[PDB]
Copies of this chain bind each other. A is one copy, B any other.
Amino acid sequence: GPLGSASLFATITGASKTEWSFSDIELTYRPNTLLSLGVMEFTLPSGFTANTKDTMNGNALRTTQILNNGKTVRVPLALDLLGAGEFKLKLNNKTLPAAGTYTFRAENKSLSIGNKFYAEASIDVAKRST
Protein backbone atom coordinates (compact mmCIF):
# COMPACT_ATOMS: atom_id res chain seq x y z
CA GLY A 1 0.00 0.00 0.00
CA PRO A 2 0.57 3.78 -0.06
CA LEU A 3 1.58 4.09 3.62
CA GLY A 4 4.88 3.49 5.36
CA SER A 5 6.03 0.70 7.62
CA ALA A 6 4.41 -0.09 10.96
CA SER A 7 6.15 1.85 13.75
CA LEU A 8 6.74 1.16 17.41
CA PHE A 9 7.98 3.63 20.02
CA ALA A 10 9.15 2.37 23.41
CA THR A 11 10.08 4.54 26.36
CA ILE A 12 10.45 4.45 30.14
CA THR A 13 8.05 7.17 31.33
CA GLY A 14 8.57 6.61 35.05
CA ALA A 15 11.03 8.81 36.93
CA SER A 16 13.51 5.93 37.39
CA LYS A 17 15.32 4.19 34.53
CA THR A 18 17.38 2.07 36.94
CA GLU A 19 17.49 -1.71 37.28
CA TRP A 20 15.42 -3.19 40.13
CA SER A 21 13.44 -0.06 40.71
CA PHE A 22 9.74 0.60 40.14
CA SER A 23 8.87 2.47 36.95
CA ASP A 24 6.43 2.75 34.02
CA ILE A 25 6.92 1.85 30.35
CA GLU A 26 4.85 3.04 27.34
CA LEU A 27 4.80 1.23 24.01
CA THR A 28 3.10 3.10 21.17
CA TYR A 29 2.30 1.00 18.12
CA ARG A 30 1.00 2.36 14.79
CA PRO A 31 0.20 -0.31 12.17
CA ASN A 32 0.29 2.30 9.39
CA THR A 33 -2.00 0.17 7.23
CA LEU A 34 -4.57 1.24 4.65
CA LEU A 35 -6.98 -1.09 6.46
CA SER A 36 -6.71 -3.59 9.28
CA LEU A 37 -9.32 -5.93 10.70
CA GLY A 38 -7.07 -8.58 12.09
CA VAL A 39 -5.07 -9.79 15.07
CA MET A 40 -2.51 -7.45 16.59
CA GLU A 41 -0.10 -8.47 19.30
CA PHE A 42 2.69 -7.06 21.43
CA THR A 43 5.49 -9.39 22.42
CA LEU A 44 7.39 -8.41 25.58
CA PRO A 45 10.99 -9.49 26.21
CA SER A 46 11.96 -11.58 29.25
CA GLY A 47 12.08 -9.16 32.17
CA PHE A 48 8.66 -7.58 31.46
CA THR A 49 5.15 -9.01 31.68
CA ALA A 50 1.64 -7.62 31.39
CA ASN A 51 -1.24 -7.96 33.86
CA THR A 52 -4.70 -6.47 34.34
CA LYS A 53 -3.43 -3.21 35.88
CA ASP A 54 -1.67 -2.44 32.58
CA THR A 55 -3.74 -0.58 29.96
CA MET A 56 -4.28 -0.39 26.22
CA ASN A 57 -5.40 2.98 24.98
CA GLY A 58 -6.31 3.75 28.61
CA ASN A 59 -8.48 0.70 29.28
CA ALA A 60 -7.43 -2.06 31.65
CA LEU A 61 -6.19 -5.16 29.91
CA ARG A 62 -8.52 -8.12 30.18
CA THR A 63 -7.17 -11.55 31.06
CA THR A 64 -8.43 -12.86 27.72
CA GLN A 65 -5.87 -10.53 26.06
CA ILE A 66 -2.86 -11.55 28.16
CA LEU A 67 -1.21 -14.75 27.00
CA ASN A 68 2.05 -16.74 27.26
CA ASN A 69 2.49 -16.02 30.97
CA GLY A 70 2.28 -12.25 30.51
CA LYS A 71 4.63 -12.09 27.53
CA THR A 72 1.95 -11.57 24.87
CA VAL A 73 -0.82 -8.93 24.73
CA ARG A 74 -3.21 -9.69 21.89
CA VAL A 75 -6.13 -7.86 20.31
CA PRO A 76 -8.12 -10.33 18.16
CA LEU A 77 -9.82 -7.63 16.06
CA ALA A 78 -7.61 -4.58 15.72
CA LEU A 79 -8.81 -1.69 13.60
CA ASP A 80 -6.84 0.63 11.41
CA LEU A 81 -7.89 2.91 8.58
CA LEU A 82 -5.33 4.92 6.60
CA GLY A 83 -2.84 4.74 9.46
CA ALA A 84 -5.19 6.51 11.94
CA GLY A 85 -5.07 3.57 14.33
CA GLU A 86 -2.86 3.42 17.41
CA PHE A 87 -2.31 0.93 20.24
CA LYS A 88 -0.64 2.41 23.32
CA LEU A 89 0.25 -0.25 25.88
CA LYS A 90 1.13 1.18 29.29
CA LEU A 91 3.04 -1.15 31.59
CA ASN A 92 2.37 0.33 35.03
CA ASN A 93 4.53 0.15 38.15
CA LYS A 94 6.84 -2.59 36.95
CA THR A 95 10.10 -3.59 38.62
CA LEU A 96 12.67 -2.94 36.01
CA PRO A 97 14.88 -5.96 35.27
CA ALA A 98 18.69 -6.15 35.22
CA ALA A 99 20.54 -3.41 33.40
CA GLY A 100 20.74 -3.83 29.67
CA THR A 101 18.87 -3.24 26.44
CA TYR A 102 15.39 -4.73 26.03
CA THR A 103 13.52 -4.99 22.72
CA PHE A 104 9.73 -4.96 22.35
CA ARG A 105 7.77 -6.04 19.28
CA ALA A 106 4.27 -5.39 17.95
CA GLU A 107 2.75 -6.89 14.81
CA ASN A 108 -0.40 -7.17 12.77
CA LYS A 109 -0.67 -10.91 12.22
CA SER A 110 -3.72 -11.10 9.92
CA LEU A 111 -6.13 -9.11 7.74
CA SER A 112 -4.06 -5.97 7.05
CA ILE A 113 -3.10 -4.05 3.95
CA GLY A 114 0.43 -2.65 4.02
CA ASN A 115 4.09 -2.99 3.22
CA LYS A 116 5.46 -4.25 6.52
CA PHE A 117 3.40 -5.42 9.45
CA TYR A 118 5.66 -5.48 12.47
CA ALA A 119 7.97 -3.16 14.31
CA GLU A 120 10.44 -3.32 17.16
CA ALA A 121 11.86 -0.72 19.54
CA SER A 122 14.13 -0.92 22.56
CA ILE A 123 14.77 0.70 25.93
CA ASP A 124 17.94 0.85 28.05
CA VAL A 125 17.68 -0.04 31.71
CA ALA A 126 20.52 1.65 33.64
CA LYS A 127 22.98 0.19 36.20
CA ARG A 128 22.63 0.90 39.95
CA SER A 129 26.23 2.14 39.90
CA THR A 130 27.59 4.47 37.20
- Would you give the 0/1 interface string for A6-40, flagging 1 where the beta carbon is closer than 8 Å to chain B? 01010100000100000000001010111111110
Inside 8 A of A117's CB, which chain B residues have their CB? 57-59
**CB distance B83 to A110 under 8 Å?**
yes
Inside 8 A of A116's CB, which chain B residues have their CB? 57-59
| Contact A34:B118 (CB < 8 A) given known A39-B78, A74-B64, A83-B84 | no
List CB contacts (< 8 Å) of A50-76 with chain B. 57-59, 62, 64-65, 67-68, 72, 74-76
Interface residue count for A (Cβ, 8 Å)?
56
Q: Separation in Å of the A92 CB from the closest CB of chain B?
A: 15
**CB distance B59 to A2 under 8 Å?**
no
Q: Separation in Å of the A68 CB from the closest CB of chain B?
A: 7
Copy number in the complex reads 10
**CB distance A32 to B83 under 8 Å?**
no
A128 lies within 8 A of chain B by Cβ? no
A89 lies within 8 A of chain B by Cβ? no
Q: Pick from B3, B76, B118, B124: contact of A2, CB below 8 A.
A: B3
| Contact A37:B1 (CB < 8 A) given known A57-B115, A59-B118 | no
**Alpha-carbon gap, A81 to B84, bound state (A):** 9
Q: Pick from B7, B67, B110: contact of A85, CB below 8 A.
A: B67
